Amino acid sequence: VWVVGMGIVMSLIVLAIVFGNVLVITAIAKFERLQTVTNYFITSLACADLVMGLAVVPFGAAHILTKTWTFGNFWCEFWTSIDVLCVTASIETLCVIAVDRYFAITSPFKYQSLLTKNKARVIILMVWIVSGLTSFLPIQMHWYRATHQEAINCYAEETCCDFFTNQAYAIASSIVSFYVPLVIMVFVYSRVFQEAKRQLQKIDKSEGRHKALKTLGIIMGTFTLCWLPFFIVNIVHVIQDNLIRKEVYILLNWIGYVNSGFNPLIYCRSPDFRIAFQELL
Numbered sequence: 001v002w003v004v005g006m007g008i009v010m011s012l013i014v015l016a017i018v019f020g021n022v023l024v025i026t027a028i029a030k031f032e033r034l035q036t037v038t039n040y041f042i043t044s045l046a047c048a049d050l051v052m053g054l055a056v057v058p059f060g061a062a063h064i065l066t067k068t069w070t071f072g073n074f075w076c077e078f079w080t081s082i083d084v085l086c087v088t089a090s091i092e093t094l095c096v097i098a099v100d101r102y103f104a105i106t107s108p109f110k111y112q113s114l115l116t117k118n119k120a121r122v123i124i125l126m127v128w129i130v131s132g133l134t135s136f137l138p139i140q141m142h143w144y145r146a147t148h149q150e151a152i153n154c155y156a157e158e159t160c161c162d163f164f165t166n167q168a169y170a171i172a173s174s175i176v177s178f179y180v181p182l183v184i185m186v187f188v189y190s191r192v193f194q195e196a197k198r199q200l201q202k203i204d205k206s207e208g209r210h211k212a213l214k215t216l217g218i219i220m221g222t223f224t225l226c227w228l229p230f231f232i233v234n235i236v237h238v239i240q241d242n243l244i245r246k247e248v249y250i251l252l253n254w255i256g257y258v259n260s261g262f263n264p265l266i267y268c269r270s271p272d273f274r275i276a277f278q279e280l281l
């Protein structure tokens, strides 16, 4: 009386994740007014979210509901690698967007020279390659495996797939994928808020006769509340074996997945995108 309807939520999540990013990509590609230097980062982020929604989520839902992994071990490793790659690429693209806004606001005269159509491509490719070296290489070369007794039994059986990793890979992956972008974004947005407050102070000092907090709160709170709880327990469960159960780990990981759906509502609600969406359908 549960699994007959518990998949409806997963189906709705998949539909929303696919549709939002497909609409964003179609709006950027089809309408010529939108194409800009900053809009390419949104394109890469939407591509990462689309790949996640198309590949990662449905197989995880099937594994959860059916309780068995009917597919082979090779496909299981492929799925894990794709998952890690997509997560890393999405978070690093968010950090790139934040840094771009920092450079746009803090130094207005020199903004044009720093960012050009031929410099954005190299940055995006570097981000995706750095993401790829984290996921595919350590997994396919069999460096992340664990040596405790249950790990060998999990690896041998072809019917089951449970994540088992050693200490070094977990720590290094968490540090590379989450914490450094978090620090960079924190510093960036603190500086941006200071500049905005100074400008409002000047506009109040002249012509004498609150709004940035809402935007910054949305932008930081969504990402932090979505992704921070997962990585803390990700680091924790390795140092202390009995501390963290697997069900909470899976629940937090699936909470992290949903964050890909909220990105179009955050980064794509400008008037130009509204006009493009209105014209599209």
Ligand SMILES: CN[C@@H]1CCc2c(ccc(O)c2O)[C@H]1O
Pocket: 080, 083, 084, 087, 088, 163, 170, 173, 174, 177, 253
């Ligand atoms: C299958 N779940 C994976 C397992 C570990 C992991 C994830 C995401 C980013 C990382 O850097 C990780 O090390 C999770 O999505």
